[PDB]
Design a protein around this ligand. Structure first.
Ligand SMILES: CCn1nc(C)cc1C(=O)Nc1nc2cc(C(N)=O)cc(OC)c2n1CCCNC(=O)OCc1ccccc1
Lengths: 166, 154
């Protein structure tokens, strides 16, 4: 209840996920009802790279930006997940911002924080966030956490493994 | 670093202050003191505050900040871009949510740890010392006087 990763998971929920998820299904449903290659899935897919290697802003060639999810100010992007050149799925995808902070804390002396500490805190953040989202009222059936560690790796396949299984 | 406060201080810098401060002086110069004044109430009571702090205009990632006129005796004594440190709202919410297991004593201790951690980060950050001032305080009071004590001394 006092760790670095506990503070970050509660902040990401309090200051962002609790304010965006109550209206996320309505925005996806509106875009699906109004427009149409494939229906956009009803959940927010949050990428959780355990190595905390999050691009500055956001990101594989098989993950093509399709459009922005409009409001009923949050810019949420819809991506087309490709396989063999053709679209295999489509969803609102984004990186878990607090993993950038865990990476920065490991790079700056002022924090200390080793590479082993960062990897342990990243899994702890993922666990704490999972536990928050399981019991949170504003996050019932519209959020899926995608945690993974790169060792042949495809980010599009990791998201497709979760989209097909739902 | 070690605790909840350290993660919040580094997040506040990484995800917001490092992206907004490089261009803050240019926005103020285009449009008021040249620094961002961040209110840090140690009780984490972040609402909005005082009749002597009147909203003047908006300063035309980081998306817009408010300029306020600090009054004293009915007349304007200063003007600056002022805002609350959002992570203190999170410390307050963590104390109000059971699944966080964070007491009122924990919240006050983490609030001070956050102020000191963010002051150290900002002293050595290339995002610059000249564009940001932290205003930490605990109510036993005028919020306009606390800001004026820092504006006049700079
Ligand atoms: C605080 C929650 N948190 N704790 C940890 C740890 C990580 C996060 C996090 O990822 N937060 C987050 N992510 C976002 C993503 C989006 C999007 N476009 O998808 C929008 C958002 O909200 C506009 C997002 N937030 C909210 C805060 C960031 N914005 C900000 O500081 O804005 C300055 C500002 C100041 C005055 C006026 C207007 C803006």
């Amino acid at each position: 209840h006092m760790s670095v990763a506990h503070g970050l998971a509660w902040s990401y929920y309090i200051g962002y996920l609790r304010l965006i998820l109550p209206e996320l299904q309505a925005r996806i449903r509106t875009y699906n009802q109004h427009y149409n290659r494939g229906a956009v899935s009803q959940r927010l897919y949050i990428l959780l790279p355990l190595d905390c290697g999050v691009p500055d802003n956001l990101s594989d060639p098989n993950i093509r930006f399709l459009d922005k999810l409009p409001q009923q100010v949050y810019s949420n992007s819809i991506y087309e997940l490709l396989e063999n050149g053709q679209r295999a799925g489509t969803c609102v995808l984004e990186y878990a911002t607090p993993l950038q902070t865990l990476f920065a804390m490991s790079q700056y002396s002022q924090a200390g924080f080793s590479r082993e500490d960062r990897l342990e805190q990243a899994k702890l953040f993922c666990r704490t966030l999972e536990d928050i989202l399981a019991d949170a009222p504003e996050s019932q059936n519209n959020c899926r956490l995608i945690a993974y560690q790169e060792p042949s790796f495809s980010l599009s396949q990791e998201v497709l493994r979760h989209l097909r299984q739902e």
